[PDB]
Design a protein around this nucleic acid. Sequence first.
RNA 1: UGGGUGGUGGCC
Lengths: 52, 427, 115, 258, 46, 67, 49, 34, 240, 192, 49
Amino acid sequence: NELIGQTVRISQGPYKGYIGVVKDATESTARVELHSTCQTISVDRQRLTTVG
Amino acid sequence: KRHIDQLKEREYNNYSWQDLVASGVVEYIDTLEEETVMLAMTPDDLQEKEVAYCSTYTHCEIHPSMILGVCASIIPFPDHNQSPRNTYQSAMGKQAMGVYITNFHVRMDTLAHVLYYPQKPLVTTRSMEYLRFRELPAGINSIVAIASYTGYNQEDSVIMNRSAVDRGFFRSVFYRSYKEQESKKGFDQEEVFEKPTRETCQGMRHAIYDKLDDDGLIAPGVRVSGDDVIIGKTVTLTKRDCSTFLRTSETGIVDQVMVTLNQEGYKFCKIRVRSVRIPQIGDKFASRHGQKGTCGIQYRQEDMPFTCEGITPDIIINPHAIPSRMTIGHLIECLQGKVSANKGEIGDATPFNDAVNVQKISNLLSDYGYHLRGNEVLYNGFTGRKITSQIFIGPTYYQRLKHMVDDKIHSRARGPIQILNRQPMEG
Amino acid sequence: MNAPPAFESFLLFEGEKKITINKDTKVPNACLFTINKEDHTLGNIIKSQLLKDPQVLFAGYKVPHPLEHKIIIRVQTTPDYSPQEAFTNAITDLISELSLLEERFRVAIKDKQEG
Amino acid sequence: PYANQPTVRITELTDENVKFIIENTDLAVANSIRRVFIAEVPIIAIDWVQIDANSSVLHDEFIAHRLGLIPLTSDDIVDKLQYSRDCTCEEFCPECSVEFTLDVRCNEDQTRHVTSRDLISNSPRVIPVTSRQDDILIVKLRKGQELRLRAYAKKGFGKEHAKWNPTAGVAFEYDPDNALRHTVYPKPEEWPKSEYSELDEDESQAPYDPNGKPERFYYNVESCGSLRPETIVLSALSGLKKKLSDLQTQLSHEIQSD
Amino acid sequence: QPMIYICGECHTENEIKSRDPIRCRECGYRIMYKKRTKRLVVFDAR
Amino acid sequence: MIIPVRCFTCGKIVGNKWEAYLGLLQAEYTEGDALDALGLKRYCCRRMLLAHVDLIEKLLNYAPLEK
Amino acid sequence: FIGKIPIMLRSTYCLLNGLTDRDLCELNECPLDPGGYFIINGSEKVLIA
Amino acid sequence: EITPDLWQEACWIVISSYFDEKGLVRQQLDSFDE
Amino acid sequence: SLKQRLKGKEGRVRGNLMGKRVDFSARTVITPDPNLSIDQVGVPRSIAANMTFAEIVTPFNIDRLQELVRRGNSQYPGAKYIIRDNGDRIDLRFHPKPSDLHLQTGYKVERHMCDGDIVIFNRQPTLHKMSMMGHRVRILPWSTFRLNLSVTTPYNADFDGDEMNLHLPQSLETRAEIQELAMVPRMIVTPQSNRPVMGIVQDTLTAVRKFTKRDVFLERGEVMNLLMFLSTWDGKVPQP
Amino acid sequence: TVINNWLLIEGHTIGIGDSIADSKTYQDIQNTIKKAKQDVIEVIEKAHNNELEPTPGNTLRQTFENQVNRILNDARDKTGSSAQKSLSEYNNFKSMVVSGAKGSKINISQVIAVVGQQNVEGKRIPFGFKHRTLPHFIKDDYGPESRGFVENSYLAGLTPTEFFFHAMGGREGLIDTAVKTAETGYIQRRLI
Amino acid sequence: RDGKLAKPRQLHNTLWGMVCPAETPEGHAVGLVKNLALMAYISVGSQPS
RNA sequence: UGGGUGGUGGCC
Ligand SMILES: [Mg+2]
Ligand SMILES: [Zn+2]
Ligand SMILES: [Zn+2]
Ligand SMILES: [Zn+2]
């Protein structure tokens, strides 16, 4: 899976502008661990943007 | 007076404590010799001429407050507290976080706690000057109000100010160091630092190795999380994974990684991971008088009560914690904190002083426009209405213990199992 | 770990109605307005304005839990006056009051800035 | 059954605080205004930091936290910028954020004070409060230590975080004399007179008023410097009125759909 | 692959390869600290 | 370790008063007069300067890890 | 040679003896450290009386 | 000469001198040196 | 020796027969929460999202269980395993193929713990019968067990750092056995001394003594504000 | 739910002002303590002149201690009763005691009037040293302040010797707490 | 430990100025662990010749 | 690579 193991930037929503690394993903959404907080959240793949 | 005058110049004069012992002014006394001496608690009182009690004194105590240990000499007004409270404070005085050593950024210690903004007490004892407490403090002076606000702080619980915490109040960072070296169990058993692959490595977990670089060591500044590879380590038989994982529910950041050699010349590395701990709910806070408690809820600034001026308490503690434990020293410290803050000088709470009492502090507080007993009129934070009872409020030294809730939460549902008796493991 | 994100206090998510109305059945002409993502800042003024209306027989608000952001306002009026129109009249009165207040404050600021 | 007519009197106005008085109003409205001063007044503050190099003795998160608390002059931009959760732009655009740059290196022997004057922004209308008495200290650097970073400032209000609170201290007080007896003094004579007390030195409190209501709410709103102290009050009233308008719109929609 | 390190005391950027005795090419100091990462780090100022 | 940017309780800006406070202290000024010479009125702000210990100066003595 | 005796910090026979605080800071050992503990395999051990 | 009723100031000078000469862990260092 | 393996405490009989370590358990600090009924316990999301409860699929609940299976294991109100009636179990944490997400009537769903579930909640020094009551779950944001204050007196809890265990019954019969026997409201009166074990304490007691004095008068606004908090109120305002 | 929300209007607290007497009860307490000291001195004097008739079934030392303890307990009870009589209707200790929420009248007495007399093993402070309790005292002294009678109150602070005797009295509670847990669990285990 | 004896645990009169009357663990080792007072000093010994 | 031993500490 391409999305697994990628540094991603959230493109829209309240979490817009934040960064993280995708841990697990599906055909609909994905799980991103935030670099700034001690928590892993779930975000939609459409609002995602791979950086680097 | 000559001895004192020479002592006051001891950086110019070579006159020191040894020269004081030499002149036969002080005399070391052990217990058996103590059995036969006559001791005077203080000269200017117990040696004047009255109806002769003993009139045969052979020694005199230097200062009565010198009989307390290191930990119990930081309690302010300890002679005003119930006896077990001092013991509890001494117990919990060794678990408060603070700058534990000046050069803490070099040492690769395990489980290092350090607080962002430690402060010296607004009301100290003369004894903690020689403990260097005013250089490595542990705690923050906080505006504490003793009132039942919402019922969220009843059974030894406290309410904290969310806005104050957002402003860094009691924020702390938590270090943790890892160690791993490669040792030769045999010519056929050799361990190396090397990034495992999905092609040749047989035994592996569900943690990918992209975080670490080709060296097998994760570089500093890389976000980590539970069950993530840290030191890529393989063994030879062919190649099985022996890599170390950051333990579950840590989610820190690799602070620094040092690489060196042991006596045998093997490669060696210690990795430090840092984590910031905001004072969330369930954390343990304690006063200097054995008043331990856990946060019950965090209200924002506009929800807390306020005075005529916009002063909102940082912590609110229940009134029911005082009467049973009779920690009147806590109340006296809170009352004198107001005087110290307004007057601008650091108050003194040496145990047996006799120059400081409640009446003097009350008059000094009245000389600044506050109620002489330290009470204030608060307004309700939600409806803005006055409160029919005046609330006792003032600065107080609190200290945040190391028993964080995030280190104690734990749950299980069909996890690992023992080998001898197939029951769940422990820990 | 279990810390909620900071914006849960004031942001509505998908499918969350801002205000919901349910007819109370115990007594006639009573309704329960459940407003999401609000706090005392709004409920207190709404309730206070509702008490000035002489056609209202009951008006109070409560927050079921400080860790959840929603308040319930209960209104009971006389038979010839629906609670909903009382609520909307209170809203209009509050808005008019605030507009007048800001206008007079601007006038006072202009007066002060030029002696 | 209708809202009464409040009046405003301003007794003192500087560029740090405003001291006014409000007449003929219910206590709940006054308290809610006091509340909106604290929480729901939008303001600009930096909320996104990327650190390139940090040789200082303070870890990166500590630097970011200290940076976030620096007040920024947002007087005419706060009402023009859109909330980042609402801007349809990709990543960050000048319409919804401001970019800051910091690059300080200590090569001289003496210590180097990294202050807010070293924060360089691309928007002249949004700068930290050192426009024209030292600056906010961030770190101190020894020889050989450097700190390079890049930050973004966006729009928020105090209900989200305390770095978006615009007011330093808001003082609120009604009925300086205890005429309404909301508070009950055990021994009245022990209590100092209030600042706004219209009472002679003999008596301690006003005689009881059986039929009275809270009026004449005194205020003293002090700004942390990011907004002019009157702009705080104006923005608070505007925000409260807008919140009520939105509630009314949703209420009408729900009523006409039942 | 070069795996640049930093000496413990002289702080001189020196390169060491895999399976090589850890030593600063000068001053013989045996403590090496890894350099900071290159991937992006983003901290919110809350 | 270093002076907080903002007063914890009220929110006043205090992180710029530290150097001025020290300078006033290196004169005839007492703390009770130095504090309100700086405009610190509420005791919540006063205690922020009054009871703060500055460990950054000691930390600056150790040689940096890099050069 | 007979053996190696572990040395207790800030003793007469420890390298951190008589040094000025400036030297201690230059050696990455703060002057506030009391000493009085042994270092065994990199762990600080204290002898309880 | 006698030190009357200013003894509070003089009482802690000897304590300060004592802790300047002998540290807080002097017993350990003395025992190991011996 | 063999005798040492089962001699005394931590032996066979006393360490692995009369006492074991069980699955489906949780433990966290406790903090007060005066807004929960005395038979409620507030659990955090991370604990709730980790402890499952098997549920039998049924035409009356197949749709909701299907939606939960669709949600998965990441999103909280989801499932963790789906068990076929033949004994085989399909994991849900490893992005399974959409064919396996289909569930029949006789299947089992290992869903997460939602509101209304029944748990056992004890404090380790288990002295008497009233230290092992059962509560109803209510999920709340932060990471701590929240319980009402009138319930502290039986448990002898103190909110000063104490911790309590949480056991989740894993079968319908066990759930009905707990609900009908050891709910908190059924344990108000102890059989030890035929008197209540739960009473009004702390601020509530002090303020109810102050509240019922002869000279406590309330205007209509405060009376409405107080009546807003009566759950059993009949909506009639008494004559003043 | 109802009471915790009316409390927001009423409020409740505790402070230094709730632990103060009217400076006229202080004189009464001081007079009571002075009279108690005089009475124990008189008993001691009558004892050393062999003018003490032994109490039925008690030795001379036993009856001496009995009169001493009776006088001290009378002093403590009288001072406590005066302190209770002194409290106002707005005091917070009284409000939290009369409702039974926390504390008891003895706590009020110890905070305001007098801490009382310390004991170990049900007896006054033993002669740990040779025929005296502390080096600061004199041999064969059976007076009140030399055997653990704390004259002051928690508000007024404790003198050094009274502080040490209070610490001795406190240690017994910790020891009892340590042993009671170890015994009761075993008893219940055997019963079940 | 695990001894019902209380005499070794009690605070003796002789512990005045030598041992802290307050600081002590409250677990199973209450009274058996002690800390020196601030002025206390331990003798090092000398030859009696 | 797991077992074993000891110490410290938390709540009663
Ligand atoms: Mg407890
Ligand atoms: Zn934009
Ligand atoms: Zn080198
Ligand atoms: Zn302040």
